[PDB]
Amino acid sequence: KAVLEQFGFPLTGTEARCYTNHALSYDQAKRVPRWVLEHISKSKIMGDADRKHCKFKPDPNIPPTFSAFNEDYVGSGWSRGHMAPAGNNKFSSKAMAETFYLSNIVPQDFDNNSGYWNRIEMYCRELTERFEDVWVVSGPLTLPQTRGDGKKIVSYQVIGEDNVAVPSHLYKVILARRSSVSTEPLALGAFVVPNEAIGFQPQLTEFQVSLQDLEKLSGLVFFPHLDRTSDIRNICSVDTCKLLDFQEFTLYLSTRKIEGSVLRLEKIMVNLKNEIEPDDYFMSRYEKKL
Amino acid sequence: KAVLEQFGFPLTGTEARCYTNHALSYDQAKRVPRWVLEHISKSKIMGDADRKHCKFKPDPNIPPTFSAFNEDYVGSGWSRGHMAPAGNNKFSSKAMAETFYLSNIVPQDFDNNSGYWNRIEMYCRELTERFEDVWVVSGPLTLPQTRGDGKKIVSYQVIGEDNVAVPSHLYKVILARRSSVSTEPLALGAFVVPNEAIGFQPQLTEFQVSLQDLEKLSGLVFFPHLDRTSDIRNICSVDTCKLLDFQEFTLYLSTRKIEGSVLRLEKIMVNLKNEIEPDDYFMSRYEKKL
Ligand SMILES: [Cl-]
Ligand SMILES: [Cl-]
Ligand SMILES: [Cl-]
Ligand SMILES: [Cl-]
Ligand SMILES: [Mg+2]
Ligand SMILES: [Mg+2]
Ligand code: NA
Ligand code: NA
């Protein structure tokens, strides 16, 4: 063995890397994270950190050969999709900046990034209202397709000079705990979503998979300390487990449009009526301005 | 971070695993090794260990979910291809048996396995005649293809119930040192061969790549202790670096047919003449029998 590792064993580059509010294992050959783990709470998702002051850039700790660069993504037909969201790190400028390191980024469909995936990230943030602590493992997937002749093929695009791997699917393992003193099994949900436009019709539960099925597909073992026979319980069994629909989501966007200059506030309300337009909290903001 | 890894970070399953005469890093999602490192010498490739007493079987140390089984390979149209060869472990029954663990095996083209790849393994064994110590890193690759429209796609087949990944290419990093007291840079050669029939016409040097180019494609850093600016020298610059041709190879097979019962030895010589048939060492064996 001393003869065998005389000049050292090859470097896989898959060791866990820690950041302020997220940890990850990088995939040196695909130039994408393999998994990204974060902890989120009521407090962490509140703060003055601003997404606008952040810039996407290679992770300084990754060898430049195995790193992706913005040139790989810009003009590819694919977006720079965060795995650990910027929006879960309002409490810390450092933490938010570190989620803009390309080591947390994956070539994600533009519509999925701002649509379905966004609503899943929003649902994870919502859970902090009902669970004191939420844990999330996010990451890419290159799943096979079975042709008519019975053959199973893994087919994915590589973008840029660096051949950044475009996944077919994205996963999220949501682990949620009520309080520190709770003795009830922790709520777990595993979801696999295709890297394409999805819309509002499909329910999040349509994309649910078993933890074992996700582990088999991804080659990973999530939250190894949890005893699968006593510590885990389906999140759907103990939570509404629903994303915001078209009406709830467009209302959420319009409420955020209520903050920014002029009497443009009349134009926002005219657009909502042109079928949604209600909500009580909405008015306690569409008055506190004018 | 204590909050973040409360239930542990996900398990990648990519840690180095040591065996008697080989080490490897497994790819839990593809069910194939990522790299396999071995040390070979004049002595190790000599012994009474017999390939016939060995059986292909899942590696006992791999979680069965991430392991491949013979059922995945048998009937797939692909062979069980050793990365660390059985033939490099004649000195040890244990060592040879451990190279039959599916953790060392890759779905390899039947012809490449017995043809070109076999001759590369033979060339590695030959180097022990000229270098006291030879180190070898072997492994699979899924490289992209550029379509006519400019798009780069990684396309590979998955075989069996377990979806064992069929590589497009196979690599070998050959590290060779003259003696323990030598101060000359070590001889290095990196080669990438497609997972298909190749034949005798292509020279091994047609498949040579730079170490840096292999590292970029594979996402690995080979022999990290070697200073690339002072310790390494192209193997082609200091070695014949040639595989056995059709005549040398068929003669080598016939010499091995000289060991096994009857006066079938006349039939072997008749087949050689039917254009090759010479060699001096050959006769010192085709007499020591009859
Ligand atoms: Cl983008
Ligand atoms: Cl969508
Ligand atoms: Cl076979
Ligand atoms: Cl061949
Ligand atoms: Mg996003
Ligand atoms: Mg072989
Ligand atoms: Na590009
Ligand atoms: Na099969």
Tokens found for residue B131:
């270098």
Whether residue A111 is found in the same domain as residue A246: no
Whether residue A218 is found in the same domain as residue A125: yes
Separation of B86 CA from ligand 8 center, angstroms? 24
Whether residue B209 is found in the same domain as residue B257: no
CB A62 within 8 A of CB A19: no
Report helix, strand or coil for B45.
coil
CA geometry: angle B34, A30, B210, nearest 5 deg: 65
Exposed / middle / buried, residue B72 (Cβ in 10 Å: 0-12, 13-18, 19+): buried
Q: Is the torsion defined by CA of B120, B122, B125, B127 positive or negative?
A: negative
Phi/psi of residue B23, nearest 5 degrees: -120, 155
Whether residue A17 is found in the same domain as residue A148: yes
CB B144 within 8 A of CB B110: no
Taking only residues 31 to 50 of chain A, the set having a beta carbon closer than 8 angstroms to any beta carbon of chain B reads 34-35, 37-39
Phi-psi category of residue A78: left, alpha or beta, with phi > 0 → left and psi -120 to 50 → alpha: beta
- The CATH number given to whatever domain includes residue B151 is 3.40.570.10
Whether residue A139 is found in the same domain as residue A254: no
Catalytic residue (choose from A39, A82, A169, A225): A82
Q: How many CB atoms lie within 10 A of CB A112?
A: 20
String of b and e for B93-115 (b: at least 16 CB within 10 Å)? bebbbbbbbbbbbbbbbeebbeb
DSSP lists the bridge partners of residue A101 as A57
Exposed / middle / buried, residue A115 (Cβ in 10 Å: 0-12, 13-18, 19+): middle
Whether residue A93 is found in the same domain as residue A171: yes
Whether residue B190 is found in the same domain as residue B205: yes
Q: What's the rounded Cα separation, in Å, for the pair B163 and B79?
A: 15
Exposed / middle / buried, residue A43 (Cβ in 10 Å: 0-12, 13-18, 19+): exposed
- Resolution of this deposited model, Å: 2.8
Total domains present in chain A? 2
Distance from A16 to chain B by nearest Cα, in Å? 8
Give residues with Cβ within 8 angstroms of B97, minimum separation 6: B54
Whether residue A186 is found in the same domain as residue A247: no
Separation of A108 CA from ligand 1 center, angstroms? 9
Q: Which of chain A's residues have a Cβ under 8 Å away from the Cβ of B150? A: none
Phi/psi of residue A65, nearest 5 degrees: -60, -40
Tokens found for residue B115:
């043809």
Q: How many CB atoms lie within 10 A of CB B34?
A: 21
Known active-site residue A22 = no
DSSP codes of every residue in A105-162 = EEEE-HHHHHTHHHHHHHHHHHGGGT-SEEEEEEEEE---EE-TTS-EEEEEEEETTT
> HSE (CB half, 13 Å, CA atoms) of A183?
0
CB B248 within 8 A of CB B169: no
Q: What's the rounded Cα separation, in Å, for the pair B194 and B196?
A: 6
Contact A152 B157 (CB under 8 A): yes
Domain around A164: 1-240
CA geometry: angle A25, A30, A32, nearest 5 deg: 45
Spell out where B48-204 has E strands.
79-82, 105-108, 133-141, 145-146, 152-159, 164-165, 169-177, 186-194
Q: How many CB atoms lie within 10 A of CB A64?
A: 10
Whether residue A41 is found in the same domain as residue A66: yes
Q: What's the rounded Cα separation, in Å, for the pair B91 and B206?
A: 33
- The CATH number given to whatever domain includes residue A289 is 6.10.250.1250
Whether residue B260 is found in the same domain as residue B278: yes
Q: Which of B82, B34, B81 has the alpha carbon at shortest distance from B219?
A: B34
Tokens found for residue B168:
């497009």
Going by the DSSP 8-state scheme, the letter that residue A101 receives in this structure is B
Please give the span between the terminal C-alpha atoms of chain B, in angstroms, as a whole number: 75
A195 marked ligand binding residue:
no
DSSP lists the bridge partners of residue B57 as B101
Number of residue pairs across A and B with CB atoms under 8 Å?
165
Q: What's the rounded Cα separation, in Å, for the pair A86 and A65?
A: 26
Whether residue B26 is found in the same domain as residue B112: yes
Check CB contact of A157 with chain B, cutoff 8 Å: yes
Q: Which of chain B's residues have a Cβ under 8 Å away from the Cβ of A10? A: 25, 35, 37, 137, 220-224
Catalytic residue (choose from B39, B82, B169, B225): B82
Q: What's the rounded Cα separation, in Å, for the pair B214 and B115?
A: 23
- Domain boundary residue, one of B223, B240, B257: B240
CB A28 within 8 A of CB B220: yes
**Closest partner CB to B65 (pick from A10, A30, A216):** A216
Whether residue A273 is found in the same domain as residue A161: no
Q: Which of chain A's residues have a Cβ under 8 Å away from the Cβ of B23? A: 1, 4-5, 9
Contact B219 A157 (CB under 8 A): no
